[PDB]
Amino acid sequence: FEAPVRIWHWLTVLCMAVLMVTGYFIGKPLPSVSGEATYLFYMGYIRLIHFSAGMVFTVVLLMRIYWAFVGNRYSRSWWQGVWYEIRWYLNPIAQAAMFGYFLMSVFMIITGFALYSEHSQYAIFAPFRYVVEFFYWTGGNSMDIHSWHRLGMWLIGAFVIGHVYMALREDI
Amino acid sequence: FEAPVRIWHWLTVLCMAVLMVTGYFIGKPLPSVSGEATYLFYMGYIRLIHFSAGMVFTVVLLMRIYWAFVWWQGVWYEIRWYLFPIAQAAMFGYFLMSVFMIITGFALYSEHSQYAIFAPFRYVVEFFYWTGGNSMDIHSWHRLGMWLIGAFVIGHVYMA
Amino acid sequence: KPRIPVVWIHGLECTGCTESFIRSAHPLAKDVILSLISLDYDDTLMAAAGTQAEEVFEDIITQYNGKYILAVEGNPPLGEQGMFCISSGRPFIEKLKRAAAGASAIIAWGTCASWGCVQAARPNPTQATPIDKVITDKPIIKVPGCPPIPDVMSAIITYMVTFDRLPDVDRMGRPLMFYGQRIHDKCYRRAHFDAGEFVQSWDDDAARKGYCLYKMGCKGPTTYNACSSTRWNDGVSFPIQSGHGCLGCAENGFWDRGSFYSRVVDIPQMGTHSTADTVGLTALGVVAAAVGVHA
Amino acid sequence: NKPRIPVVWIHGLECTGCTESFIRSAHPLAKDVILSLISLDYDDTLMAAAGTQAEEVFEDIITQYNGKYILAVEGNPPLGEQGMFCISSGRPFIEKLKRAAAGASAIIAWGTCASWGCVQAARPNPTQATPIDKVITDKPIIKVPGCPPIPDVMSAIITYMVTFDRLPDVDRMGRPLMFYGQRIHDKCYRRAHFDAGEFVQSWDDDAARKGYCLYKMGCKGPTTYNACSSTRWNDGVSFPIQSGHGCLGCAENGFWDRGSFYSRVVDIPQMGTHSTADTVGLTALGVVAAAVGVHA
Ligand code: HEM
Ligand code: HEM
Ligand code: SF4
Ligand code: SF4
Ligand code: F3S
Ligand code: F3S
């Protein structure tokens, strides 16, 4: 068994809200506590909720993308790119927004997993270890992965401020 | 102030979500911090965000009715019948909790040596004392109210 | 068993610190003097004067060299070759250095010895200087305040006698026990501060209900001392409790920190009820005026 | 010159591991401790005098320096067989202990033996071996547990008491806060693996060769207070976990009787980040794979 099609959107939103709130505090952690670190795991739980929200998010996102593809794009190699451009200068800047949004999510996954699979996951995560070499090729290290990952989160939050105001503008 | 009726909904949900998340932590506070309390105000901010979200919320609820709606023994003839599909009684109950959450919530905020327009809320305190309790019970019933709302919110997320 | 020798000398001062010491409720100053220490020199209380007093001084610092505690009240002036404070025809700073040289530790009583206090305020006519700027080769325990709390003074004394050690100190040389926290962090009026409930003028309704004195210039938020917890004169009161804001008298150069009746700065301040009352009336007025009942 | 503080070091039922540990000290060397910081006036393991000469030393020290010497105790007294499970000068060791403690200013309880009872006190404790604090009740006793305690911890506690002229601050149990204030598990360099859910499952597996956590091999780090994970052993060369064996819990009271050393510790919160998130991912990947029809 499964459910209605809007479940697989409210999920992503739930995942998104969690990956943001948690990922935020992985980089700018909450105030410090004090006790006996045997019985305390606050930061560890934030990271855990993050990685596994990122698991769910990743699965849902990829199935949700697989269908839009199979179904022609949306509506029920740079040619199409250069042509998207001519008709693009005349709602055409709103599609490129929803597209950029799904492009970010995938970037947040490629980068997010490069970090997660690092300490020798040694299985199906083998490709993500090109992302690392790439950032090294850039003349950087895995710290840059963290930085670009944190940036992606802010960029997503930008669309969300737009996409939310744009939706609430459908309070006709 | 004569914008859509969409606006006065999403605000309420925003207020609700805040008054819940904040009110929760006024009662079961977050882990302790340590430093110098001159530069620290975490609980104080939580309490501040609460009281003032409770302000906005109250105003908007006092207005999501005067919008909704639009002698003292003449209205009686038409209200008495509701006193004697049943899918309104839930939406009605919800608005009733909100008002209970306001009466009790302000009862706490107001009786703090305020001399104002909050004078009626004092009765709420005397009522809880008449009950054979004190303002701690106001705190308890207030907290319970939050759970009950979350129950509806829990239920109203049926889909319809 | 013999009692630890204590030499108590006085520079430029008001004798407020000596006075404070004898206010001690527990232990009584009487019992400190008879049973806990050996107050071997103290101009205020000793019988001997002049050449007799000088003989006592010399005898103690010689006989107990390296073994006595030096207690310093007041401070030395550098102006006029030190002759702004004269002891036995010579600058007080000479007696200070001589006494310091044989001491095992120095207690700097009050703001005077610790920092400079009132005589060091603008324009410092006598070039009054705190002890630690003059003596650099000895452990110096600063016990600031004008004066310090009587029972704090005696508690520090009993600590050093009983535990046979100097109290742990901050980077300023203040005993952590009584100076580790700010007045403002143990003030019984913090509720009002945090609510935005302030005295605005003397003897208003707010003052008669014991509201916060922040707006009356209370320097509590920047002052380290024990007055809000230990309190004064056998726990009877402290400045804020009797309705005056903290002057900051335990802090370095507090006399020159602007008027005592001027608000303190760079202290975060955001009331709970003062903010929420404002958010309420902002919303209520936006509403009442739209309906038409601005009146 | 300057006199050194007199120290009387007596031995009950023990393995002499604590004395051995003491002389392992890297800084200060045991040589310099004996030469310059203290006066080791009685110590069966090292002293020249034996027999009646040893007895004379003992009597002379505790009498001359009565109320002024430190009593260091290694091992513990047996209560069984009227105390004759441990005989010193033809008499019960406990009599020596009591006589020594009566004149001491303070007592150091070296190791788990003196602190708690250690191996001889394990089930069924044939000799009724008893920790010092159960026998001596009117003197300050500083417990320095471990089997044995860390060499440099021992010397550091000694240097502290000499230099600062006082006893170290202690917990409710009498252990010095400085070295026993935290758990092995709270300063273990393998926490990263613990926290990720990366464990050694059997000896010399790939996990073991990468230095993964030893929680599932029975490590009692989570319940053991000691400095082994920070201070380390033998001039900071290693400690049990670093060389691949889990903590036995040797600084803790009755640790011998806390089940097998290769049995997991209980009531210790443990939820791995990568272990949980790997599960969450496959649970979701497998739910979808089932619905699409590419199961297995
Ligand atoms: C909307 C998607 C996501 C958002 C908004 C998000 C947000 C964040 C943020 C802000 C950080 C902190 C970066 C820093 O300051 O160092 C973070 C860390 C991290 N994220 Fe994400 N993330 C997302 C998706 C993912 C995914 C799919 C994974 C894959 C498992 C992932 C794995 C990680 C990892 C491994 C870290 C750092 C862990 C650590 O070393 O503590 N993220 N995330
Ligand atoms: C849906 C609306 C509201 C929810 C869910 C809510 C939730 C809560 C909760 C759970 C508490 C914790 C009480 C406890 O455990 O002791 C609390 C405290 C409080 N609430 Fe509300 N509340 C709401 C509305 C209001 C309103 C309108 C006011 C009026 C200003 C108010 C004022 C307070 C006050 C004054 C306190 C406790 C004061 C203190 O910190 O000592 N609340 N709220
Ligand atoms: S500002 Fe002064 S009166 Fe107000 S809480 Fe702080 S110390 Fe007390
Ligand atoms: S269980 Fe043992 S090996 Fe693992 S982190 Fe804790 S102390 Fe270290
Ligand atoms: S004035 Fe001085 S007495 Fe205390 S209250 Fe302020 S430090
Ligand atoms: S066994 Fe003992 S040696 Fe330390 S590592 Fe555990 S306390």
PDB file of C-alpha atoms in Angstrom, chain A residues 36, chain D residues 25 27-28 110 142-146 148-161 164 167-171 174-187 221 224-233 251-252:
ATOM      1  CA  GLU A  36      28.454  14.156  31.769  1.00  0.00           C
TER       2      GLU A  36
ATOM      3  CA  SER D  25      56.655   7.715  37.184  1.00  0.00           C
ATOM      4  CA  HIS D  27      57.791  13.188  35.894  1.00  0.00           C
ATOM      5  CA  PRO D  28      58.848  13.492  38.581  1.00  0.00           C
ATOM      6  CA  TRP D 110      46.530   3.368  46.658  1.00  0.00           C
ATOM      7  CA  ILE D 142      42.040   9.822  49.634  1.00  0.00           C
ATOM      8  CA  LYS D 143      41.073   6.992  47.306  1.00  0.00           C
ATOM      9  CA  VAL D 144      43.300   6.672  44.266  1.00  0.00           C
ATOM     10  CA  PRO D 145      41.655   3.700  42.487  1.00  0.00           C
ATOM     11  CA  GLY D 146      42.718   1.680  39.462  1.00  0.00           C
ATOM     12  CA  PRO D 148      47.000  -0.089  39.329  1.00  0.00           C
ATOM     13  CA  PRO D 149      46.427   3.677  39.122  1.00  0.00           C
ATOM     14  CA  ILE D 150      48.303   5.524  36.348  1.00  0.00           C
ATOM     15  CA  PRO D 151      51.983   6.066  37.395  1.00  0.00           C
ATOM     16  CA  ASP D 152      51.988   9.785  36.562  1.00  0.00           C
ATOM     17  CA  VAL D 153      48.639  10.275  38.248  1.00  0.00           C
ATOM     18  CA  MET D 154      50.112   8.805  41.442  1.00  0.00           C
ATOM     19  CA  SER D 155      53.130  11.126  41.371  1.00  0.00           C
ATOM     20  CA  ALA D 156      50.986  14.121  40.370  1.00  0.00           C
ATOM     21  CA  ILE D 157      48.811  13.564  43.415  1.00  0.00           C
ATOM     22  CA  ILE D 158      51.921  13.363  45.570  1.00  0.00           C
ATOM     23  CA  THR D 159      53.458  16.521  44.046  1.00  0.00           C
ATOM     24  CA  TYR D 160      50.132  18.319  44.452  1.00  0.00           C
ATOM     25  CA  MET D 161      49.991  17.536  48.172  1.00  0.00           C
ATOM     26  CA  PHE D 164      50.104  23.008  47.556  1.00  0.00           C
ATOM     27  CA  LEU D 167      44.685  17.308  50.142  1.00  0.00           C
ATOM     28  CA  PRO D 168      43.250  17.242  46.583  1.00  0.00           C
ATOM     29  CA  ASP D 169      39.531  17.994  46.209  1.00  0.00           C
ATOM     30  CA  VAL D 170      37.469  14.807  46.137  1.00  0.00           C
ATOM     31  CA  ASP D 171      34.091  13.484  45.004  1.00  0.00           C
ATOM     32  CA  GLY D 174      36.884  10.240  48.108  1.00  0.00           C
ATOM     33  CA  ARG D 175      38.499  10.197  44.667  1.00  0.00           C
ATOM     34  CA  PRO D 176      40.533  13.223  43.529  1.00  0.00           C
ATOM     35  CA  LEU D 177      38.418  15.278  41.148  1.00  0.00           C
ATOM     36  CA  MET D 178      41.456  16.175  39.080  1.00  0.00           C
ATOM     37  CA  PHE D 179      41.889  12.701  37.588  1.00  0.00           C
ATOM     38  CA  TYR D 180      38.650  10.911  38.512  1.00  0.00           C
ATOM     39  CA  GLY D 181      36.157  13.680  37.740  1.00  0.00           C
ATOM     40  CA  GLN D 182      35.314  12.380  34.295  1.00  0.00           C
ATOM     41  CA  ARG D 183      34.714   9.032  32.575  1.00  0.00           C
ATOM     42  CA  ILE D 184      37.032   7.204  30.207  1.00  0.00           C
ATOM     43  CA  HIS D 185      34.189   7.275  27.738  1.00  0.00           C
ATOM     44  CA  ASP D 186      33.960  11.062  27.936  1.00  0.00           C
ATOM     45  CA  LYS D 187      37.542  11.529  26.787  1.00  0.00           C
ATOM     46  CA  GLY D 221      34.713   2.868  29.558  1.00  0.00           C
ATOM     47  CA  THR D 224      34.574   4.019  34.622  1.00  0.00           C
ATOM     48  CA  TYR D 225      36.097   7.159  36.174  1.00  0.00           C
ATOM     49  CA  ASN D 226      39.837   7.532  35.474  1.00  0.00           C
ATOM     50  CA  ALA D 227      42.360   9.502  33.397  1.00  0.00           C
ATOM     51  CA  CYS D 228      43.521   6.758  31.060  1.00  0.00           C
ATOM     52  CA  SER D 229      42.030   8.299  27.913  1.00  0.00           C
ATOM     53  CA  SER D 230      43.595  11.707  28.468  1.00  0.00           C
ATOM     54  CA  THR D 231      46.717  11.275  30.637  1.00  0.00           C
ATOM     55  CA  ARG D 232      47.409   7.793  29.272  1.00  0.00           C
ATOM     56  CA  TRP D 233      49.886   5.140  30.434  1.00  0.00           C
ATOM     57  CA  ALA D 251      39.114   1.851  38.672  1.00  0.00           C
ATOM     58  CA  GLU D 252      35.544   1.014  39.752  1.00  0.00           C
TER      59      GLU D 252
END
